[PDB]
Design a protein around this ligand. Structure first.
Ligand SMILES: NC(=O)c1ccc[n+]([C@@H]2O[C@H](COP(=O)([O-])OP(=O)(O)OC[C@H]3O[C@@H](n4cnc5c(N)ncnc54)[C@H](OP(=O)(O)O)[C@@H]3O)[C@@H](O)[C@H]2O)c1
Ligand SMILES: NC(=O)c1ccc[n+]([C@@H]2O[C@H](COP(=O)([O-])OP(=O)(O)OC[C@H]3O[C@@H](n4cnc5c(N)ncnc54)[C@H](OP(=O)(O)O)[C@@H]3O)[C@@H](O)[C@H]2O)c1
Ligand SMILES: [Zn+2]
Ligand SMILES: [Zn+2]
Ligand SMILES: [Zn+2]
Ligand SMILES: [Zn+2]
Lengths: 360, 360
């Protein structure tokens, strides 16, 4: 029906026909004291959107609305709301959508690591409702996880930051990325590029680390201080020995990644932080003998604090990421999904034209 | 013959008979401009002394004088010596004995991680001579790697800190071991014991992590603010979820770290540092999302700068490690290698009584 009782969206109907989501109406989650309703206007197509829909993460209950780099207008506020969020405001919602908000980790700005963590879609809340929203007309989210979008960031350029961006930003900040450091980006995909830009915006000397040579010209155009092509090096660890302070791995998979070499290019005390979550059938493998004075670790999304910090940065040092736009709808999400599989993205897809697709 | 012509120690003869080191004389390494000669007066038994003799590091060119926790007085100073070391001065030498002292890692106090790194024993120098010293009347080391043992530290207690000690000290100071911070030591062995102490010494709430409760009492005696039993407490990472900032492991190895549990006990940002040395080819496989907000790596000895700090620390806060001495001689050694390869050590042996064993 309409916005209050039913939500509509382009939802995955089966993990086999994942490339052909169908428009669907579905019950919103129950509305809670702090939840907020957002009418979407733009959403970013994230690699996770794919892994999930393709069933790479396990059998997900269907139907399923994906997409978690949401930008839209506040349309209704929860009873016990409190955060200046005002109906009509252009806000954003990323990958996380809930946290206990009371444990130390939460109060210490580490809600991505909260015990009661809940992702935007494909997860059941305590009430049992499995998070939806994203490629839809409305999303229902607890206010703590809704951020304001700096007035000067085009929606189609703000959206991706909400997850792909925040995902590189959190590890970068936390691990010293900034003036005078030598940062490295593995995998120039959707996150990688944002991670390259954001890298520079923070002040470091960034190295893009890809396997083929295709993305070279593009990397420099983003401000890369240098480019490396694994397949063309034979042992870049050996060659770039003792150069990197921090390296963030943003690959969609870890199969074409040598964690037995990477350490060499790491300065004493350097740190390797992987950001990826590959198919359920993959491990992070390496001969430990190399983690000599080098630390390897995995990182989740970022804190909402960091998320606002990023939004501030992109807004201030005026960051313009690489996005292509497609209209929400079965045909658009199809092309989006299709191309993401083909890796045929000039980095980021942002579904738009939400109002001329969902009507009432 | 004697000191100038050639030394003599309790050398090993074969990786097989490694438990029966026969006394042997050998030509000292060349005496370069900046080297120094030390008539050892005390030495500590390091686990690695065993590991090397047993051949866990591969087949070594025989014979071989192990031991690299050397304590002794200065005999001669190379023609260009400029450390400020006086002859007869009480100094010490540990696991490292050389570094290019010209590379960045060096001018930045990271000698252990230097390219031209050379260990105290069983390794050829730039010139080919295989490093000796240790369980002998003397040892010829580059002055740079000679530290002035503090006047108030009984030489049978100073020695262990040269290696063992320093090995845990570094990981601790480099990872912020101190007031507030909650340190966790895994493996109440030799290195593990000096760790618990130094940890408390440095002002950090310390937990000792062993599987059994055997050493449970000793731990509390050394200052441990708490004790944990691996096998005994089942899922300790759960019980102690989100507590440790740092954990320096000293057990069997890094690939024995049940990451399906240990990480759990690490607070977001936590560091698991192994101090054991992995096989150049051991390969580790943890979930891509296993080290969630937890890093993992290993450390090697420490810089002399740190080595001195440790000494200064031990001197001032006056710490006494749990040492048991033995006669520096074929007989003694056997008792040591024999009780080391068993754990029948009250943490650290110190082969003393040099003067009354080598004569001339
Ligand atoms: N922890 C978190 O909070 C979080 C949040 C969001 C996403 N993620 C993870 O981030 C990934 C999403 O990727 P994305 O959306 O940023 O980018 P994407 O547009 O999917 O591109 C991924 C890029 O990584 C590289 N890649 C793909 N397959 C690879 C393989 N087999 N071996 C080595 N490199 C490969 C490619 O770059 P090159 O060809 O240039 O090497 C590719 O362009 C997923 O794995 C997801 O689980 C984690
Ligand atoms: N990187 C460096 O600079 C450096 C310098 C010196 C030494 N090291 C390394 O440090 C180790 C030397 O040990 P150490 O001399 O300090 O002590 P040690 O007296 O040899 O005792 C080692 C202790 O670790 C634990 N352990 C032994 N086998 C184990 C196993 N299979 N699984 C789990 N835990 C086990 C035991 O403690 P619990 O029974 O209480 O658990 C044992 O008492 C070697 O592995 C060496 O390579 C590295
Ligand atoms: Zn929480
Ligand atoms: Zn994402
Ligand atoms: Zn040692
Ligand atoms: Zn050097």
């Amino acid at each position: 029906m309409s916005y209050p009782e039913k939500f509509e969206g382009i939802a995955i109907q089966s993990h086999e026909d994942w490339k052909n989501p169908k428009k669907t109406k579905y019950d919103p989650k129950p509305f809670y004291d702090h939840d907020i309703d957002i009418k979407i206007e733009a959403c970013g197509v994230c690699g996770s959107d794919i892994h999930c829909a393709a069933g790479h993460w396990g059998n997900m209950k269907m139907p399923l609305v994906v997409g978690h780099e949401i930008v839209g207008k506040v349309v209704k506020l929860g009873p016990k709301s409190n955060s200046g969020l005002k109906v009509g405001q252009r806000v954003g919602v990323g990958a996380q959508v809930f946290s206990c908000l009371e444990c130390d980790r939460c109060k210490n700005d580490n809600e991505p690591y909260c015990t009661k963590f809940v992702t935007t879609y494909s997860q059941p809340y305590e009430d049992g409702y499995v998070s939806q929203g994203g490629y839809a007309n409305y999303v229902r989210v607890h206010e703590h996880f809704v951020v304001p979008i700096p007035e000067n960031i085009p929606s189609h350029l703000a959206a991706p930051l909400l997850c792909g961006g925040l995902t590189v930003y959190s590890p970068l900040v936390r691990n010293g990325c900034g003036p005078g450091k030598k940062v490295g980006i593995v995998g120039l995909g959707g996150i990688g590029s944002m991670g390259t830009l954001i890298s520079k915006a923070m002040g470091a000397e960034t190295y893009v680390i890809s396997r083929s040579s295709r993305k070279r010209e593009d990397a420099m155009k983003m401000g890369a201080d240098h480019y490396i092509a694994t397949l063309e090096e034979g042992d870049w660890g050996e060659k770039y020995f003792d150069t990197f302070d921090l390296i963030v791995v943003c690959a969609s998979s870890l199969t074409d990644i040598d964690f037995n070499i990477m350490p060499k290019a790491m300065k004493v005390g350097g740190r390797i932080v992987s950001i990826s979550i590959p198919e359920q059938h993959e491990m992070l493998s390496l001969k430990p003998y190399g983690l000599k004075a080098v630390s390897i670790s995995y990182s989740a999304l970022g804190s909402i604090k960091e998320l606002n910090q990023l939004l501030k940065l992109v807004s201030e040092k005026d960051i313009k990421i690489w996005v292509e736009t497609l209209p929400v709808g079965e045909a658009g999400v199809h092309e989006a999904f299709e191309r993401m599989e083909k890796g045929d993205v000039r980095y980021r897809f942002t579904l738009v034209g939400y109002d001329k697709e969902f009507s009432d």
